Structure 1
Amino acid sequence: SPWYYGKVTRHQAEMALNERGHEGDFLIRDSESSPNDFSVSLKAQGKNKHFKVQLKETVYCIGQRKFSTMEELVEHYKKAPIFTSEQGEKLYLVKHLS
């Protein structure tokens, strides 16, 4: 993800912008105040500004369950059944078709 600078703090973002930033230069970093979100830190008018960007990450929903990644979904259904028949027959995922 080329658009992401680094997990630098608000203060560290300012230090970088003060050292080598110019009008309109920006960086995108993890938010300190809200660790799962981001901040866009911008040099403008001789000052540094910070804008919060809230992330609602991906949700994979199947039946009544929700997973943040497809890998998690897959593993879950190797240990718990993805379908139980009415005869109680539990069907599980075993491995990917090559």
Structure 2
Amino acid sequence: REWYYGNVTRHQAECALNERGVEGDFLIRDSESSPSDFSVSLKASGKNKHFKVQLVDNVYCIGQRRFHTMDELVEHYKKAPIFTSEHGEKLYLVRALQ
């Protein structure tokens, strides 16, 4: 309802995870500046993992890799910058707030 409005990260992401590293909150947003630009930030133990999503050569890249998906990887965190921690679990690409 109030998660994906068109732009929610970098500035809004903090406006939602202001807490500074709360739960596995991840949000991806389109970059009005570009036609195929997407950005998403996740929360961690006091840390904030931000990644850039750009469409390269008819491909959808996320962070520092290329995948066949762009803003759909947040639905099933497929080959997404998602990463697991010893007892922190996978940095899952979900959504903004509950």
TM-score by length of 2: 0.40
Q: Which has the higher strand share?
A: 1
TM-score by length of 1: 0.40
Q: Which has the higher helix share?
A: 1
Q: Which has the larger radius of gyration?
A: 1
